[PDB]
């Protein structure tokens with residue numbers, strides 16, 4: 187089945203039948219335990235939502251492609267409020283070239299090591315066969331309201347042998363998602379007075395995609411395969427006014443409709459796969475080079491994450507990410523039928539950022555230890571990792587799975603991530619599952635680099651109105667989480683019913699500090715001698731909720747599926763504020779009618795529960811007025827079909843958001859001077875949208 191406790195598979199069939207516009211996030215997010223959320227309560231860049239597992243935030247969601255980590259978003263400046271001006275890392279593989287997606291949440295994901303505290307999404311691509319196969323895929327959508335960005339997507343796939351032991355697979359994609367009109371939020375905006383009069387919170391960023399992958403699979407022996415692949419992707423945005431704080435200047439307006447960031451993402455990977463009597467071997471080298479070219483932005487206060495007119499033009503941040511992976515697997519007939527997996531891992535992140543480390547100390551006074559001018563462009567970290575997993579069978583149907591992961595981070599120090607997963611046949615129809623693991627987060631190179639410096643005159647300073655600096659902290663402890671999960675599932679003859687409880691106890695979540703640890707010396711006027719805060723480790727936080735699935739076969743022809751998220755708690759236990767803002771619940775329902783041999787018809791509904799904004803502002807003070815505004819529960823319905831003309835040719839068509847339920851980004855969550863808060867109204871919900879699709883394949 188497509189749901190067990192902790193885990194979800196999305197198939198190619200699934201992707202086919204509920205096509206995403208462009209980014210996979212759209213379909214990935216319908217899994218139990220998954221939200222589409224920011225990393226923080228700020229609401230900053232809040233139309234740039236990413237995949238969240240169990241309310242742990244997107245930085246704790248590890249994206250793999252064919253088991254190889256995607257780190258590209260680490261090339262984007264990590265801001266005061268724990269957001270990046272990033273669209274996330276799910277738009278690198280084109281929808282129609284995906285074989286399947288694995289979503290692994292909580293204690294079952296901790297093994298994957300660094301940044302699987304939320305969970306792991308593994309995007310798996312279609313591979314070459316025995317014969318040569320190919321495909322050509324087209325999708326085009328059509329919003330009812332012209333404001334809203336339409337999407338167009340053309341991908342090709344082409345696979346097979348060339349020798350009896352050589353195979354290849356290639357794909358290409360071209361896609362475009364029109365940005366929402368600059369003014370789509372007009373009249374829904376938060377109340378904006380004085381200087382900040384006129385200003386608009388922005389709709390969805392557009393994106394242009396170009397993805398090209400090649401693989402060779404070289405099988406030199408019966409029991410030896412060697413794979414080479416290179417990947418080339420490019421995303422360039424279409425700007426529609428977005429800024430950290432929703433303020434404007436002239437440069438902003440100049441760029442409306444223009445490309446203001448481009449990511450180039452290049453991957454080369456060597457993968458050797460081994461299978462003999464004693465068991466199975468797998469090891470790879472990936473080199474990921476991300477170039478993040480974007481218009482220079484301010485780093486101070488309300489100037490944080492707006493285009494800086496003083497210093498106009500592009501800079502380029504460079505991420506070199508190097509990953510090497512080894513495992514063997516050993517069956518052991520030891521009384522207990524069991525299987526044993528041994529592994530090393532090595533990673534290096536090199537970050538060059540020419541712009542992030544260029545906040546100066548003129549207005550706030552200088553900081554002992556930190557040069558005010560031409561501070562290093564370099565951060566790096568290496569993690570070395572050992573692990574073993576034992577997959578024990580105690581008695582046919584029971585499985586006990588203990589594992590130890592050990593990580594050496596070359597700055598933060600040693601981590602021990604132990605794990606244990608039980609699954610238990612209570613009946614041939616019922617399985618009880620329980621898991622407790624300590625998952626791992628290495629601080630990001632922004633949080634960790636004491637040359638990385640943000641400044642506020644006071645509007646963004648915790649526990650005061652005076653000027654303050656926020657500084658990187660190479661002393662930081664890693665984030666750990668003890669993810670508990672207890673679940674039950676009935677599964678028999680396409681009747682599936684499951685309910686999981688999850689609680690993640692969240693130690694040393696890394697966040698902008700609350701207390702000053704120093705005061706700067708000198709500078710200008712009332713701003714002189716600013717406070718120094720660091721990135722610190724909040725001692726305790728908790729998330730808590732429920733995952734449900736129910737699948738009823740109404741007839742042979744007819745399948746009713748449901749996935750449930752219910753978010754019980756999300757508490758920073760220090761401040762008492764929320765971690766993420768997610769909907770109180772999420773119910774997805776598909777009806778799948780196999781209405782003929784050839785035709786198949788789909789109805790969908792999503793219910794989103796209430797959404798509540800953060801309680802406290804940047805000061806730690808209780809928010810007031812429209813900063814408290816919540817989002818009411820609402821639903822989104824869809825009808826679609828796939829009508830299959832032949833073995834060679836299939837067509838799709840349907841409607842997202844049948845009833846044109848629309849929402850509009852009013853701004854960020856809290857008030858600043860001149861810009862009333864928007865509470866939970868931080869994102870744009872798209873309206874009615876027709877779509878059509880075409881797949882030719884052999």
Ligand SMILES: [Fe+3]
Nearest residue numbers: 487488643645
């Ligand atoms: Fe300010």
